Amino acid sequence: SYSEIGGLSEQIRELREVIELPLTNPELFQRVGIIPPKGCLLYGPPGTGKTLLARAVASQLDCNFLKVVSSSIVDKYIGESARLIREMFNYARDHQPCIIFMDEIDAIGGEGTSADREIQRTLMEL
Amino acid sequence: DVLPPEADSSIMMLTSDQKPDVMYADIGGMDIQKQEVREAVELPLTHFELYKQIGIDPPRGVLMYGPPG
Amino acid sequence: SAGFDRHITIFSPEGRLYQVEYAFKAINQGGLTSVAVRGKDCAVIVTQKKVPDKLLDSSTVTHLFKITENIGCVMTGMTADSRSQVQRARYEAANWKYKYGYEIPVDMLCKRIADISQVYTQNAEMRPLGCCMILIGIDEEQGPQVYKCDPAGYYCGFKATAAGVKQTESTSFLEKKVKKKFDWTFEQTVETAITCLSTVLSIDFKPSEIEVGVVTVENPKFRILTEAEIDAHLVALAE
Amino acid sequence: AXXXXXXXXXX
Amino acid sequence: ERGYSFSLTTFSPSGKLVQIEYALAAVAGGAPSVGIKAANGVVLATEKKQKSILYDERSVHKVEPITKHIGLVYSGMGPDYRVLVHRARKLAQQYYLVYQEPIPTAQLVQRVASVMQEYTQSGGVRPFGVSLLICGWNEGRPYLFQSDPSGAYFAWKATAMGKNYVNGKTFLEKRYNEDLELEDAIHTAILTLKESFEGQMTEDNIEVGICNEAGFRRLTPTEVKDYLAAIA
Amino acid sequence: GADREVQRILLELLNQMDGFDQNVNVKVIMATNRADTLDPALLRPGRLDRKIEFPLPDRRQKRLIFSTITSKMNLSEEVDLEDYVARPDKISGADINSICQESGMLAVRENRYIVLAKDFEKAYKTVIKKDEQEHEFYK
Amino acid sequence: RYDSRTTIFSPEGRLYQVEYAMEAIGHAGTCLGILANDGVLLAAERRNIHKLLDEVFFSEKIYKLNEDMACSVAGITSDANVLTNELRLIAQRYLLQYQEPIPCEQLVTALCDIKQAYTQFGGKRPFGVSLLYIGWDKHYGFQLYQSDPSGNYGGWKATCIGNNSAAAVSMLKQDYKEGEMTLKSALALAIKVLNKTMDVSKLSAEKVEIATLTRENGKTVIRVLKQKEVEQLIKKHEEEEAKAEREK
Amino acid sequence: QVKEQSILELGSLLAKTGQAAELGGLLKYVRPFLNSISKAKAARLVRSLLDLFLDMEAATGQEVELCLECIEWAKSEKRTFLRQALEARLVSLYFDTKRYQEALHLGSQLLRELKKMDDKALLVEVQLLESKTYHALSNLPKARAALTSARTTANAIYCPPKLQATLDMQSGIIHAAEEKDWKTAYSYFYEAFEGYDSIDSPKAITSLKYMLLCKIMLNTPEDVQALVSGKLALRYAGRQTEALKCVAQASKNRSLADFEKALTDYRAELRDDPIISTHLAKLYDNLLEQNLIRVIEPFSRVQIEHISSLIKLSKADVERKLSQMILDKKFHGILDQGEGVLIIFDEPPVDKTYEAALETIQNMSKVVDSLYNKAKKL
Numbered sequence A: 001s002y003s004e005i006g007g008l009s010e011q012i013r014e015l016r017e018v019i020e021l022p023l024t025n026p027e028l029f030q031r032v033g034i035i036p037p038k039g040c041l042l043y044g045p046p047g048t049g050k051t052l053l054a055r056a057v058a059s060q061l062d063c064n065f066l067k068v069v070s071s072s073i074v075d076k077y078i079g080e081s082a083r084l085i086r087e088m089f090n091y092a093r094d095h096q097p098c099i100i101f102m103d104e105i106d107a108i109g110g111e112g113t114s115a116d117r118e119i120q121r122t123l124m125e126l
Numbered sequence B: 001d002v003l004p005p006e007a008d009s010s011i012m013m014l015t016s017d018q019k020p021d022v023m024y025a026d027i028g029g030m031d032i033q034k035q036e037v038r039e040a041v042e043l044p045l046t047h048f049e050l051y052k053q054i055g056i057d058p059p060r061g062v063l064m065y066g067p068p069g
Numbered sequence C: 001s002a003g004f005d006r007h008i009t010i011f012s013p014e015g016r017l018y019q020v021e022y023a024f025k026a027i028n029q030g031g032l033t034s035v036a037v038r039g040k041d042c043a044v045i046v047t048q049k050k051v052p053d054k055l056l057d058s059s060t061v062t063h064l065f066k067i068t069e070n071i072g073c074v075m076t077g078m079t080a081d082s083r084s085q086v087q088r089a090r091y092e093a094a095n096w097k098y099k100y101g102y103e104i105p106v107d108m109l110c111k112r113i114a115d116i117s118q119v120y121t122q123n124a125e126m127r128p129l130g131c132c133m134i135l136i137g138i139d140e141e142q143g144p145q146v147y148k149c150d151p152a153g154y155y156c157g158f159k160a161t162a163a164g165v166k167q168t169e170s171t172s173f174l175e176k177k178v179k180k181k182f183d184w185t186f187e188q189t190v191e192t193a194i195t196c197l198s199t200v201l202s203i204d205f206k207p208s209e210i211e212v213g214v215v216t217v218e219n220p221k222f223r224i225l226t227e228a229e230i231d232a233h234l235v236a237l238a239e
Numbered sequence D: 001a002x003x004x005x006x007x008x009x010x011x
Numbered sequence E: 001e002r003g004y005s006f007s008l009t010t011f012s013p014s015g016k017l018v019q020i021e022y023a024l025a026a027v028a029g030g031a032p033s034v035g036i037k038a039a040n041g042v043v044l045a046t047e048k049k050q051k052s053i054l055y056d057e058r059s060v061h062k063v064e065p066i067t068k069h070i071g072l073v074y075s076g077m078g079p080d081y082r083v084l085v086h087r088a089r090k091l092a093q094q095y096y097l098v099y100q101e102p103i104p105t106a107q108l109v110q111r112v113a114s115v116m117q118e119y120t121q122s123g124g125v126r127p128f129g130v131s132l133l134i135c136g137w138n139e140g141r142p143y144l145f146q147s148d149p150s151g152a153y154f155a156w157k158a159t160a161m162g163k164n165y166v167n168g169k170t171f172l173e174k175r176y177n178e179d180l181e182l183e184d185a186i187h188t189a190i191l192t193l194k195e196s197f198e199g200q201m202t203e204d205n206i207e208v209g210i211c212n213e214a215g216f217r218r219l220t221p222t223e224v225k226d227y228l229a230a231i232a
Numbered sequence F: 001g002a003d004r005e006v007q008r009i010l011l012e013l014l015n016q017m018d019g020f021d022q023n024v025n026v027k028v029i030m031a032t033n034r035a036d037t038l039d040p041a042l043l044r045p046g047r048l049d050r051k052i053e054f055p056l057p058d059r060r061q062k063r064l065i066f067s068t069i070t071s072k073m074n075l076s077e078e079v080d081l082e083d084y085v086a087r088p089d090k091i092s093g094a095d096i097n098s099i100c101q102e103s104g105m106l107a108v109r110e111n112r113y114i115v116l117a118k119d120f121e122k123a124y125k126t127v128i129k130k131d132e133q134e135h136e137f138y139k
Numbered sequence G: 001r002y003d004s005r006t007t008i009f010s011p012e013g014r015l016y017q018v019e020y021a022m023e024a025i026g027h028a029g030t031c032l033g034i035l036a037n038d039g040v041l042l043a044a045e046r047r048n049i050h051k052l053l054d055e056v057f058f059s060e061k062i063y064k065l066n067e068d069m070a071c072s073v074a075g076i077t078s079d080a081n082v083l084t085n086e087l088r089l090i091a092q093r094y095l096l097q098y099q100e101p102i103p104c105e106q107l108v109t110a111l112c113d114i115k116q117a118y119t120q121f122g123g124k125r126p127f128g129v130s131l132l133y134i135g136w137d138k139h140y141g142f143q144l145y146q147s148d149p150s151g152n153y154g155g156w157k158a159t160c161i162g163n164n165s166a167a168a169v170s171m172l173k174q175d176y177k178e179g180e181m182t183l184k185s186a187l188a189l190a191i192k193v194l195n196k197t198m199d200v201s202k203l204s205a206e207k208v209e210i211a212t213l214t215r216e217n218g219k220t221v222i223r224v225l226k227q228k229e230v231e232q233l234i235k236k237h238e239e240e241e242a243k244a245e246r247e248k
Numbered sequence H: 001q002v003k004e005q006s007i008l009e010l011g012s013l014l015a016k017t018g019q020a021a022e023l024g025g026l027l028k029y030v031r032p033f034l035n036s037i038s039k040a041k042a043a044r045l046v047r048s049l050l051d052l053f054l055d056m057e058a059a060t061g062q063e064v065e066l067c068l069e070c071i072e073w074a075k076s077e078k079r080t081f082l083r084q085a086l087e088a089r090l091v092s093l094y095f096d097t098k099r100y101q102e103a104l105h106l107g108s109q110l111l112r113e114l115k116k117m118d119d120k121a122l123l124v125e126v127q128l129l130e131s132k133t134y135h136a137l138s139n140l141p142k143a144r145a146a147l148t149s150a151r152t153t154a155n156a157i158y159c160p161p162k163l164q165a166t167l168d169m170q171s172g173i174i175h176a177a178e179e180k181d182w183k184t185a186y187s188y189f190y191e192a193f194e195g196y197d198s199i200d201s202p203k204a205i206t207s208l209k210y211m212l213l214c215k216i217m218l219n220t221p222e223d224v225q226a227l228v229s230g231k232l233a234l235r236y237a238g239r240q241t242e243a244l245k246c247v248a249q250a251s252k253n254r255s256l257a258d259f260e261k262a263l264t265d266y267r268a269e270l271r272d273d274p275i276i277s278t279h280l281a282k283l284y285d286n287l288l289e290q291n292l293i294r295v296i297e298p299f300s301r302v303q304i305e306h307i308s309s310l311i312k313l314s315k316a317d318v319e320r321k322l323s324q325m326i327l328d329k330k331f332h333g334i335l336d337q338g339e340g341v342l343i344i345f346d347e348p349p350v351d352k353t354y355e356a357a358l359e360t361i362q363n364m365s366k367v368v369d370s371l372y373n374k375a376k377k378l
């Protein structure tokens, strides 16, 4: 339950907005004519419980949740890193709707080496 | 028997149900750019008689470059 | 975005000195925040004094230092480096007065302090000082003045500034404040600094949880409001 | 660094 | 050139001292300044836009004097500007005490540039990442020089460093007639900045100095406001 | 063995576009955000013939852009889109879609079913203050 | 790879940095000095000739070292200033110490040692500047000296450095003239060589720069011909060019 | 110097007094004075003297004559900058006087010389006058290249705000005559408007009127209300802005009679601006079709008299418009005059089978021929 995460009333309230709304009452977004908002970037000190809030949101909506440890997706061999991201979104098309929770995203988003542009390619794929 | 080949979507050949749904009037402005693209990737398929009437083989590639967004 | 970084003297390809950049991110490692608000004739600096022990000699846990009889400074960032920056400043002013016949205007004291920090950014000898300084002083012909010198040596004249972990909201709060122009009375300024620090953190600000400095045009001397006064001020803020 | 890799085929 | 980018004392295989170039990137990504030499004098402009209202716009001035007849405008790392100016005023001064005449703007840049080149000959000192525009009126002919972090000093008639510099130059070559006068020149200089300054040209947002026959002087907020009002 | 396999891709790209096996009626559209890093062989009139450029919308394309994103949005009659299309800031196309998609999201939060002029200004200051971080010392 | 420091010897014995440096001269402007009795000339190219660029010096590539010594430059701008600064200071010291003009060659050796000395002690970047010297002395009269970034110098009768050095040097050979090198012939060839060496045709007068050194009544006037005379010079070559087409 | 200033003033007051003979005489009298003054000062002086002279409404026929005499006069003294100046104004005068072929020819001469010469500031001005003259001549595909010539040369010059307005207004007319894209037609008008607005020029109103027209023609007669009040439109708010306002409601309410009331209520506001007439007339001539079809949709035979009552148009007006609509294959029907009825009906297909047979017959007709040739071999 949202209640189980503690002291994030405002933050939990916000993340409800962007994530929950387009999935449950799309009419509101299509009534005003704006495409449903998609995506929430939760930044904070490690262990604060970013994942849980992102996990409760799945539990309330009863929508499938896919968790990707973003740092892991950046494997050494070339083009594997873009591919894991590609399979994630391609997996989503098959199973809808799924909160794609990417863990620390600093790795893939945020220069002159073969490997220094593989990070560049993976961002472009994302 | 010679069964019909199968190359419908091997590399994501846009199916009749994957049309992006963005009409030309929906794109805003880009008056000059749209015509240049509309002159190498759209027009030749339809009006190929016009291209061959002037003796120029229709341009085959377009490279849209510019600031992101 | 790590860049060549590992050396302060080697430019990143985009023209960004990453090592200098990391300096500021070291600035908030102190875990505290200081706010300076310039009023009609006063400047008030409020800091966070979070003494995490019953054994700490509370008298010496201060972030506020007195650079000179008319200029007071607060450090936000690494205590060790902030101490050196304080000590280097004091000489810089004393050399200023001894060299030109008058007290160094608060304007330059950040300039010379900034200039010292800037050469540590070129000549890869000294690791940069990881602390921002705020100089407050009643300057003749220019009223109370406030300045904030950063690790890279950038100083500016601030109607109000705050450096620390919650800088973005502290400045946004102040930015909201200064705009609805009002008669910034000494009581108003001291109140404004306390509210700014309070709102960002969401704390009650017990009497001893902060160290508010005050400098006024009427009595151009650096003073640190004694714990009795902050309570009086704090109760005034409530009502 | 970035390493391209070949591959065999266990029949 | 991939591994030779870092050290400023190691030629790349193509004979390219990359580090100087990357420093020039820091200039090409700085506050826009514009310079125009009108047959009556030299006009310089730069945008002094702060990040919030909390700043005191009059605190730090970019368009600055060196002597009574020379001034500077910079587009790059600020603090690296100040170290440049001081060695500029001292150098402008060290010329006066020795020769007793105001330093010709050609010499000052020849020695304000030679100051720059000093830091680009050894490892352990970063290049001065601030291109400089120097205006002066000496020997009855307006002067506008640009000294770079690379140590090369030009003789620009009218240019603009900083963000969106390519566009600024294109506006010049368009609205720059070698036969203007200082009065018209100020309007052109402001307009060149207007092509990039993202906002209203408030009198505490653009700082302009005029290098005329009498000497250089950082325009007071009002007079610019008189100028800015006219242009708008 | 890595920059070599990125180069084996560009060359395989070059060889099919204009190579010994000429194809009939296969047009190639390519989009890039840099336009100079591209290999000179892939910009030579024959493979990528028309190098269309998409420059940041001027004070005019911004108007047309605003009129198409909003012409579906419910705008309260007091929203003069010409008040925001004149501001000199060099907003890009996503930013105009942004300044509009989030503009309505501000209205949606307050449960109001009509985007008001107040939000657009609240929206208009969020999609353009992109410095934020900076560091003040690069200027 | 052994190109990290200017003092590291490659296994074959090549100071790579010096090869990298002197090879760097290629990116620079073209300067040439032709064979000439009773004179010798330098012709440079103003690579950057944009419009908004106010011309204040008129001699961006030709410097006067001593009262009878002129040297061009082809390389780094910053290093060019410091070498031209060190060159003059060396020449004037010789005049002060011996009350006699520095006899050309000892000027090049003085600078060449300074340039070479950088190629020996570590931590100093090899001067990436070659520079033509012309002048006169009481010892051998008009001389031409070609300095290199690697310090090695050498007397020359006609040479070009920088952009398209190969094209200029060969042609200066192809029509190379020995003995019969009067100044007028030198001028015609000098602009003649720049015509093809300089990619942009028409050798527009302002886009070229000729400085000549002559011994007049024992005064050694070092001249930097103004645009007007270049226009007629370009015209003089221009008129001669048309007459050659008659072959067809 | 002192002699230069006064003669500027005398013409202005004289222009106010309209002593064209005195002004024209002054212009010819100031001719020796023009020699006594600088080429730059005289140019703008003669310009202002000529502009002021041509400004006066005393159209006595010497305007073309004087400009020709001014054109020759510059020819003798060799004041090429001025002669390109009088010519530039002369092309402008011709266009306003309806004398087009002459306007194009002289301008075509001006473009011949200007192209190689300097003063690209005049190339855009003259290149525009050809662009707008080519529109009146009805040569639209040649105006599109003409204007893009001014906008392929405007990008390389200063383009003052006044000129930047003209290169727009003429660039919204040419997107309007093509009747293909309006949103682009409207965009240029709005940009054209703001340019004139700033300079406080009288033609900024023509900018606004066309903007409303672009909105009206785009099937959006509701947006007209907004702009007609707007923020920069209130200052201009008058009859002209009201003229388009009444038409807009006419299309929104779709009342051919109402539209006709507007076209008659306001004659010098819609019928005197040919861009507003040609385009608006096409509207009413189209609003009638879309309304005729809606009325006839139910009926299968309706007295031509009755359709007149619904559309609120005279039987003759609907008698014709029906005739052209049937003729042009708009709707499938027929007008019988002896019963005063329009016989609506459905067109049956072209029964492809018979078309494949007729084509096949010719096919086999050709084969039977080739059989002949085999028969000749015997």
Ligand SMILES: Nc1ncnc2c1ncn2[C@@H]1O[C@H](COP(=O)(O)OP(=O)(O)O)[C@@H](O)[C@H]1O
Pocket (backbone or CB within 6 Å): A004, A005, A006, A044, A045, A046, A047, A048, A049, A050, A051, A052, A053
């Ligand atoms: N603020 C919190 N509220 C509730 N549970 C929390 C909180 N912080 C951590 N937890 C606990 O830790 C886990 C969630 O931490 P996690 O979301 O992975 O942290 P982060 O993503 O910030 O690194 C759960 O077991 C949860 O019960």
